[PDB]
Amino acid sequence: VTKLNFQALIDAQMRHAGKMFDVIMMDPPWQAYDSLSDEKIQNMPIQSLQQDGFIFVWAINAKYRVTIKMIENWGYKLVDEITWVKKTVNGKIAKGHGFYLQHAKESCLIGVKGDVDNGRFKKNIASDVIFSERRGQSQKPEEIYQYINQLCPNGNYLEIFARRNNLHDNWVSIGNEL
């Protein structure tokens, strides 16, 4: 999304709410699958988009360390990780496309920036682990947004790189093929 301008997003958002986004989740296209070079995703002003909030970034096991660098690069400090284990019709079964391990799981990093002490950001009632089975391709389980909602019950949310697979209440998304 080098072509895209986030300036349009900032001017509308601040005037419209006076508040920058509380939470931000992304599923970056990694170089097909959106054909994105690692740098380009890595260099967008996500710092600009939200001032005092968490971020959520889904990292593939192959690409896990990289994104840690990435969120930490944007002025975040790593705090928590949410791991989802795929449930087939019964049990914990998952795809075997793991070179040394079968990968039956996905991990979503949580990054923290700014002051989150104040009242809206309620604490310590969350699932580190989600059990829901893989949904129609390609999608994240419904418990996440229900989880995020507990964290920031009445706040602005921003999703990035969202095919309008799950357009959501109070959620704003910028995507390629939406």
């Binding site: 928590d80 449930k87 793991g98 039956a104 059990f131």
Partner: protein
């Protein structure tokens, strides 16, 4: 709505312990001399002992894999510590921790595995998100085994999947890593030379080199 299968391999279906028992005060010592090359290593890091001041680059052959442990908090700093030490991250296995107190809680029961037998009846009452109660804005209820690669007895790569489920220590004073991880090691690697550093007297393993200090 899943149960039992998850808990089978994790617990209740190698007993004896004994190809070296290196003993030392590791702070004084250096590890280069001890026998190598080793094509795999396993550090029980639940204790969180500083590993940066560890020399592992020399001992490992050009090609090797490293298994490391963080029970909860230190997910990101292990990665730098290894990068500094020369290893590139490859995979994750999460030990997902189910509390024993929560399992034996309902319907009312006390002892222990007793709960293990009852997964048949138990399974009906509660869902995997309900027994995940555990003893940072989350109660992290996991431990993560971290895997690295250093260079360019069942072989197959998709042999053991990343997750496992266990029921938490009955006794607080337990500092062990489940014997099943060794099987993951030994299945994943058919190479004879493997190593465990910071081993107990209990944990020496056949055809493994255990290096430990006293207490």
């Amino acid at each position: 709505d899943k149960v039992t299968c998850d808990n089978l391999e994790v617990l209740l279906q190698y007993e004896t312990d004994q190809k070296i028992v290196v003993l030392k005060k590791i702070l004084g010592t250096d590890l280069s001399q001890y026998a190598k090359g080793v094509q795999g290593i396993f550090i029980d890091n639940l204790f969180k002992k500083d590993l940066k001041n560890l020399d592992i680059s020399k001992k490992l052959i050009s090609n090797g894999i490293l298994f490391i442990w963080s029970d909860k908090s230190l997910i990101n700093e292990i990665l730098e510590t290894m990068e500094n030490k020369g290893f590139t991250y490859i995979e994750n296995l999460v030990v997902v921790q189910l509390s024993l107190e929560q399992a034996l809680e309902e319907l009312n029961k006390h002892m222990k595995e007793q709960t293990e037998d009852a997964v048949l009846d138990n399974l009906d009452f509660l869902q995997q998100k309900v027994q995940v109660k555990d003893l940072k804005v989350l109660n992290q209820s996991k431990q993560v085994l971290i895997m690295f690669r250093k260079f360019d007895l069942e072989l197959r790569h998709q042999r053991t999947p990343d997750v496992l489920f266990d029921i938490v220590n009955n006794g607080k004073s337990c500092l062990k890593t489940k014997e099943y991880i060794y099987q993951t090691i030994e299945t994943l690697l058919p190479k004879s030379q493997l190593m465990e550093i910071f081993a107990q007297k209990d944990q020496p393993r056949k055809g493994w080199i255990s290096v430990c200090e006293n207490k």
